[PDB]
Each structure stands twice: as C-alpha cells, then as structure tokens.
Design a protein around this ligand. Structure first.
Ligand SMILES: Cn1c(N)c(N2CCCCC2)c(=O)[nH]c1=O
Ligand SMILES: Cn1c(N)c(N2CCCCC2)c(=O)[nH]c1=O
Ligand SMILES: [Mg+2]
Ligand SMILES: [Mg+2]
Lengths: 546, 546
C-alpha cells in the first residue's frame, strides 16, 4: 500500500538543523531561553519568517527584520543583546554547519530503488547572501536522488498550512494512505496525519529509520554499504569536439573545478567511469569522461595508423585546445592508462597530474622489437591474436552480449583463460554461449555497451593494438626523460594480465610516484571496486592536483 | 609570390625574450658579462641546452645541468656565483615575464586574413615545472591564430640545423621564395636565407613590421584597431543537455574558471556571442553560450506555454543541475536579458552574478494588464504584431536572408521603423527585397543564422512574446523582493526600443546595481560594439564575480 516517502530537509535529510542553532546560540551567549526562537516566529502567519518561507522576500531582506524582532523580544524580556550580536553571522555559520545526514539519504535511496516515489518537502528561503553557493551545493547534492523537491519559497505555501499537503499529494499522484512522511517538527506532521498519511516524528535518525523500516517492511538500517552513485546516460551533458576533418570526440561532462579527463581501456566506454563520474564532480572537479577514438559516439576511422599513440595523444591535445583548456588531470585505465603516461611524457605542460589504473609505465626497450617483447609473456598472447585485421573483429562482433558478459567479470568469476589464445583459435573458444551475469553488472548495463558497439564494432578499438612498431619507435624518443609531474599508479591485486609486479620498477622513471593498491580487485577496476577507486582518486587529486 | 609568413616565439611573438633575462640577470647580479649565456650554450650541438630543445630531456632535468654549466664557467672566469643563485628561480620569473607582443600577433592575423599561410617555428622545451601552466596558457592563446606551430622539442630538430627548415617548407607546402621568415637571432635566419626565403631580423617590433609591410605590400602598421577574435562554429565544443523528455538544450563551451552562461535575444543564436566567447575564456572564465529554447540546435516544442518565463527559468535551473553546476554568472541580451533578471529574482542561490545588455528590469505593474502596458509605448507595437499565431511566422520565414539582413543593422543603417507595425501589416512591408549587407556582418555570418532558422523557424522564438499574462502573474509574486546579488546593467545609446531612459529607476529594485553605457551602439549590442562590450564585461566579472 505505501508507495511514496517524503522527507523534510532541516533535521531530517540534513544535520544539525538551524532551529537548533537558535537554541545553541541562546545558550552560548547566555540569552533568555527561547528568546531567539520567539523573534524567529514573531507574528506567526503574518510575520517576517513566513513571508521569507513563502518567497515574498529574500534571505537578505529578512535579516534586518529578524534583527528588529530580536531587539523587541529583548526589550520586553528586559535583557540586553550582546555587543556584536549578529543574525547574519549566526545564520551564515548555521547554514554552513549543516551537512547531509547520510543514513537518511541512504534510506531514501533504498526506498527509491525498491520502487518508492521519493520527495523532499521543505520550508526554505530564497538565499541571496554572499555565501549562498554553500546551500546551492547541498541542494544539488541532495535533490538528484529524489523524484521531487518541493520548496516552500517556490510554491508560495508553507508547512503546516494544509494546502501544501494537497499540493504534495497532487505532485506525488498518490493518495494520503500511500504516503509516509517524516519531519522533525510535530506540528508539521499533524496535517499529514489528518489526511491519513503515515507520519514519523524524527528525533535521532536510527529510531525514525526503525519506524520507517517497520512501516514499509524494507530493510533500511544495518543494510550493506551501498555502491557509489551511477550515471544515467540520458541525464548527462554530452559534448562533442571535432579535432580534425574526419574525427570528432564525444565526452560526458559533470561538475566544476580543475578539469579531470577520464580515459577508458579496451573494449570499453565513457560509461566505464559511471561510478567515478558523480563522486569526482561532488569532490570539486570538472569531469570529462571520454569515448576514446574508435568508441561509442567518437569517430572510428578504419585505418590502423589513426590509432598509433602519437596521433591519439596529438588529438587529445587538440581536444584541450578546442575546449580552451590549458591543462587537465589525465586519469586512465588499461589502454587509456598507457595513453596518459604518454601524455605525461610528451606534453607535460598540458597535464596537471597523471594517474593510471592497472597499466604500468614500462619504457620501450630500444634493443628488443615490441613483437618479440610481447612473445616474452604468455599472458600477452591475446595481443598477437589481435594483430590480423578481421580475425578478432569477427569473434568479438559475432555476439555482443556474450562478448561483454564474458569479459566483464570479477576475478573469482573468470570464464576466459588468457592462455594460448592463438593456439585455441579465439578468446571465447572455450567459454559459454550464454554466460551468466557478473555480480559487477546489471543486464541493462551490459546492453548499453552492446548498443554502443553496434555503431562501429571492434575495428577501431582493435587498431589500438596494431601499432606496436610505430609506438615503439616513438616511445624510444622519450628514453632520456623522466616524469616529474604529479603521478599516481593504482595496482589491482587480481588483474592477471596487468599484474601489480609489472609496475615494480616504475620509480626509476617516476621518482616521486605515488601509489594505491586494491585488493581482491580484478581487471575491470572501476566497476569491481568503485568505492575504493573513488577514495584513492579523490584523496590523490585533493593532495596533488589542487 | 609571397604566400607564407613564419614567426619565432621568443623575441618575436612574445616579449621580453629569455636570452635577455640571462643578460639582465648577469647585470642585476654583477656577474661577468656573457657568463650565463656561455653556460646556456655550453657544449654547442652536444650540450645540455640542445638536448633540451630537441625533446631528449625535460626542463626540470635540464635545470641542474645548467647549474653545473654555470659553476664550471664561474670557476674558469675565477668569480663566485652569488649565495642563493638559482636557475629555477631565474627561469621561473623569465618565463612568467614574457607576454604576447600584440603588434606582431596583429600583423600575423592581418597577413592570415589576406590569405597567408602562417606558422610559428620555435626552439622550445618540454616544460614540467610546477609553474608550467603559465606557458601552456601563452601557447594556447597564440597557437589558435596560426596554421601551424612547429616546436623543436616535438620534432627532434632545432634552429639553425638545416633539416628543420626543410621540415618547415614541407609543412607549409610552399617553396622557399614564397616564405618570409622573422627571427630575433641572425644565425637562425642564415639557413632560411640560403634557401632563398625573405628573412627579417627582428630588433624593435615596428622596424620589422616596416620591413614586413614593404616586402608583402600589405598594411600592417598603423592599421585600424581590429575586431576581437570570432568563433568558427565547427571548431567549438558543442554540448547537449536533456532538461526533460521533449527538450534538449544546446550550448557552445569554451575556457575554464567560474561558469558564465550567455543568453541571446530574439531572433538570435549562441553565435550572437561570437565576439565575446574567446575574450571571456581568455579572461579566465568558463563560457557556456546557449541556443535558448526555440533556437538553433535546442528543442523547439510548438506549444505557447513551453515558452513562459517560469518554465524557461526552471529549465535553465535543470541545465545547471545536469551539468553539476551549483552556480553560473548569467549574462543576457534582449529576451535573454529579461530571463536573467528573472533568474536573479527566483533563483538567486543559483546566480553568481547577473548582467543584462539593453534589457532593463521593470517590475510588473500589479494594476495594469501587460497588454494594456504594452499599448502605452508606440515603439512596442511590434509586440502586438507578434501575438497572433502564424502571422509573424509567415513574414519572418518567407525569406530568411532578407529577415536577418533587415534586422541585423547598425543604428545609422536602419531600414525598419518600429512605428505602426500592425497598421502597416508587417515588420518589412516597407523595406527592400534584397537589403544591403550591414557593416556589422559578413555574408557568411548572415547565412549561419539562415541555416540555423531552417531547423525550426520562428514559432518557438515568437512564442517567447506570447505569454504576457502568464509572465505578469508570475512576476507579481516577486514584487516584495529586491535583487541584492551582484548586477550589471549595460545601456546602448541608440537602441530605439530598449532605450537607456527605460532603465532609469532600476536602483529602486537593485540598489547596488553597476552600469556601463555604450555610445553609438544600436540594438545588436554584441556585434555592433564587441570591443567595448568585452571590456565592460571582463572588468565587471573580475571585480564582482571573482
Ligand atoms: C580477466 N582479464 C582480462 N580479460 C583482461 N583483458 C582485458 C581486455 C582485453 C583482453 C584481456 C585483462 O587484462 N586482465 C584480466 O585479468
Ligand atoms: C532597430 N531595432 C530593432 N530592430 C529592434 N528589434 C529587436 C528584434 C525584434 C524587433 C525589434 C530593437 O529592439 N531595437 C532597435 O533599435
Ligand atoms: Mg525540519
Ligand atoms: Mg628567438
């Protein structure tokens, strides 16, 4: 029967509440108990604060009204306000003090995931203070997780007036007995209750979640640790830049602050960074998640040499130029990892910082041809399989579902040995027709990649492996150099190809190199361990790219 | 015969040159004359500096090599280097000291405009210093104006080695006698001269321009003040955001730093900001130039109410939300101007600063219906003409060329009175079939707008005028408020509709309002006076949005 959950903001989705800054201030300053609260509510439905909450006047216009209220209350209470008493100051601090109550957001997220319509209904104000960005940020971080946000000052109504609850019901398209509504103010519950809504009086969070959990019959408390926020492809800003006549690059873009350019591996997509994109934006960065050349909505010319590193890097430079970016932080995985190390080596003026997941930096060997080098590691045999134009294409294109469902698997779920791929005749010769779904991905996610690869298939992506000689000769030019810009290498314990030991000599070429290491993590790092990837990246960005 | 011009960077396109920081430093510090220069060149083709300029080693690797050179030179000159002597320090300062030599860039721009292929050919380095962004910025600002930039450290060759000039010729696809090449170092000219290139030894800029002007037969010196940099539509990053199921907004995006969202008027385009887009990026801002709803590559639903202010503003808010932007600066012109004032009034938490060109803020009159209000000004008659769906569409769509060529004219070139448009039967009933081209626009520019309006025509744009009652009622909600965030109103002397006197009472509603005023400037502000618009905006952004 319950179909919808509605949350207040102050004291429910965000803590501490401001009403409790009035109380704390009165104490701190030894003012009569309740004095500030009395000034706040002065005049009831006709007072300054209701005008504020209804959108009639802005925060800044209200501040001196509260001021006057406070003087009038202190005069009748026959006390003096303290020299330097300041409403602006009290509220500035209160508004910046208040953070998202994570357990409550997590319970709302959970209810939405099992099918609840969720809404935030709040008494709030039009904030024109110099410091208003703070609150704008909070509301953005919160509102994205909900079906609706109803704000008193946008609708001209306030809790507890009954018309707002009618407006709520109509927005939900639900009847009162389908709604649970949580608030920290009992008078605000009363009208919800009159209509027959389940209402929860929120004091400490855990008790309200207990009541919410009992009343919905869904686990909300003690639940396992949830994944980071993912990206819905059709809610993203999509960007397109032509870097030369036949080639346009596509990217998804989110957030503001230093530019951070994300470069995926083979055979992937911008969407491989779906767990990192909202977290890095949230952390104060401008994320640009690419489709690399050959993929998704980026161009995919047929010719092998279009995909050598030299050209790929020059095109990434052109990308910054057309976007008007003097630098970006470059973070890559797998092939995207090899590329960013090259950006570091050939265009350090354009790289604010560099990081790689899985892909080590190993200088080219000027004496050994890369083909020969490759034969020296049984686990790189798949690379030789990939050389002959057409062969890997036909296997990889034959059944896209099975391709992604076979590749994208956690380390304890593998279905492809990387062993003697050439001899076997294929990458999948000995894996199922219909693979089971990895714990790492939903069916919908597999299908996005399938739809992406329907545009150009595997020729462009495979081409990235078909320039071993050209990249070797180019890389040899850089053997005298070191990487001396900020740099982060992230190893993944259970990547059986890019093993962590392959990265061991990196400090000889990158002496100030920083590291993270992720246990129990296979090759598809970003989706296998998205929580730990995000922590290691944000911590490194904040300390080394900021 | 001369088809190509080639410029050096240090001492030609950028001043002061660094070689002249070696000289200045020796003086400043009372070291033997030439000592630093000797350490710099130590070892000639095999020395640290040639390795640097060839890309073998990075700037940071080079610094201690120069150091050692300097010690060895001071030992043989039997002098002491000064306590705290520091190469890193000397070059940090030198590299940040050096700016674009504007008269030289302006001469290159001019030669390119009359058909020269232009190139920058420079001895430079792979810069990995903590401060490398400085140089990255300079190179970006410079390189966009040229056909090629050839860098010693990317090609593995250096001036004066002859192979670089051969590489130059091949890049130009020109023969030596078609090339003028300018350098401040005579030894670098010598090989150009051996091949039969016109060469110019650059000491003071003006003399070299005199020689360049005589040798090309094109005026370069004393030329009139050029326009700001414009945008080539196909070199821009194009962005797309879906704000709700039927509506996607298109924008062009350039630069990094605080977000600045540009909102054009009727019947315009993102491209109306082509003169401001490169200047504001260059000034340290992230520009987002919209196609507003109804225009260009943004969606254009048929229904009138899709274009009322309330919906338009909510959709702009959604736009920030999906881009992950807590705020943008909003700068509008004409209709875009009315909109940004509404963003200021209804979402001040989301507006970092607001500016309008031409469009004043005039509070809705709660006693007078807006239709009646509109009849009160003979020069708003065109607004009534625009009400009847279909009528203005048919006139405006009939001949797109003539539409834009009639509208887009400077104030002394007008062809349409705004007088009794209804009575006359149209906006163009008494203007030419084939109008002449305004000084403000080239034929190509008129045609971009024509191509844009071929996608959706004039229904969506006209709709912006068809919600006078709905916007009035909405605007009445805001009559108690003031705008107290930073705000800039720009009047244009010769706009005969949005006259400057219409803005006179603005300080009653916006008490800290700043102003600029542009003389001799008609309605199409951004293109009529792009240089003065840019100065007034950058100066206001830098002081009020920063
Ligand atoms: C299971 N696995 C795995 N499939 C890969 N591939 C990445 C994509 C191309 C083929 C190899 C890897 O690099 N490391 C692994 O551990
Ligand atoms: C010449 N002129 C002019 N055409 C306009 N229009 C803008 C576009 C819609 C019709 C009116 C104006 O607002 N001010 C002017 O001075
Ligand atoms: Mg509350
Ligand atoms: Mg020079």
């Amino acid at each position: 029967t319950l179909r919808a959950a509605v949350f207040d903001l102050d004291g429910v989705l965000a803590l501490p509440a401001v009403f409790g800054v009035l109380g704390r201030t009165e104490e701190a300053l030894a003012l009569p108990r309740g004095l500030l609260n009395d000034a706040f509510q002065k005049g009831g439905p006709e007072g300054a604060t209701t005008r504020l909450m209804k959108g009639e006047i802005t925060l800044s216009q209200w501040i001196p009204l509260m001021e006057e209220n406070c003087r009038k209350c202190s005069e009748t209470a026959k006390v003096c306000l303290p020299k330097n008493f300041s409403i602006k100051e009290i509220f500035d601090k209160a508004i910046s003090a208040r953070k998202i109550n994570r357990p409550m957001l997590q319970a709302a997220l959970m209810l939405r995931k099992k099918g609840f319509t969720t809404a935030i209904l709040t008494n709030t104000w039009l904030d024109d203070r110099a410091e208003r960005d703070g609150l704008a940020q909070l509301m953005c971080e919160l509102k994205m997780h909900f079906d609706f946000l109803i704000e008193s000052c946008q609708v001209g109504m306030v809790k507890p007036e009954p018309q707002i609850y009618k407006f709520l019901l109509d927005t939900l398209k639900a009847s009162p007995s389908e709604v649970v509504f949580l608030d920290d103010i009992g008078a605000n519950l009363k009208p919800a209750r009159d209509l027959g809504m389940v209402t929860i009086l929120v004091q400490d969070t855990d008790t309200a979640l207990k009541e919410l959990e009992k009343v919905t019959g869904i686990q909300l408390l003690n639940t396992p640790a949830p994944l980071p926020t993912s990206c819905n492809p059709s809610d993203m800003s999509h960007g397109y830049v032509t870097v030369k006549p036949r080639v346009r690059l596509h990217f998804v873009e989110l957030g503001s602050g230093p530019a951070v350019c994300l470069c995926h591996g083979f055979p992937e997509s911008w969407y491989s960074w779906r767990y990192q994109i909202p977290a890095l934006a949230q952390a104060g960065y401008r994320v640009l998640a690419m489709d690399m050349k050959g993929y998704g909505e980026s161009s995919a010319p047929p010719e092998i040499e279009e995909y050598c590193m030299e050209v790929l890097c020059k095109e990434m430079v052109t990308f910054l130029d057309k976007l008007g970016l003097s630098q970006a932080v470059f973070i890559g995985h797998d092939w995207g990892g090899m590329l960013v190390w090259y950006m570091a080596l050939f265009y350090p003026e354009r790289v604010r910082a560099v990081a790689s997941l899985n892909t080590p930096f190993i200088p080219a060997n000027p004496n050994m041809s890369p083909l020969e080098s490759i034969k020296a590691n049984p686990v790189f045999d798949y690379q030789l399989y990939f050389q002959e134009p057409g062969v890997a294409e036909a296997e990889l294109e034959q059944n896209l579902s099975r391709t992604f469902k076979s590749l994208f698997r956690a380390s304890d779920e593998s279905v492809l040995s990387m062993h003697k791929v050439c001899e076997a005749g294929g990458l999948f010769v000995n894996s199922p027709e219909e693979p089971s779904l990895s714990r790492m991905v939903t069916e919908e996610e597999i299908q996005f990649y399938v739809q992406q690869f329907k545009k150009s298939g595997f020729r462009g992506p495979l081409n990235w492996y078909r320039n071993m000689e050209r990249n070797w000769k180019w890389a040899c030019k850089s053997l005298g150099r070191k990487i001396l810009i900020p740099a982060l290498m992230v190893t993944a314990e259970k990547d059986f190809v890019l093993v962590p030991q392959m990265s061991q000599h990196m400090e000889d070429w990158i002496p100030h190199l920083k590291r993270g290491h992720i246990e129990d993590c296979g090759h598809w790092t970003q989706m296998d361990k998205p929580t730990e990837v995000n922590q290691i990246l944000i911590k490194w960005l904040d300390s080394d790219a900021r």
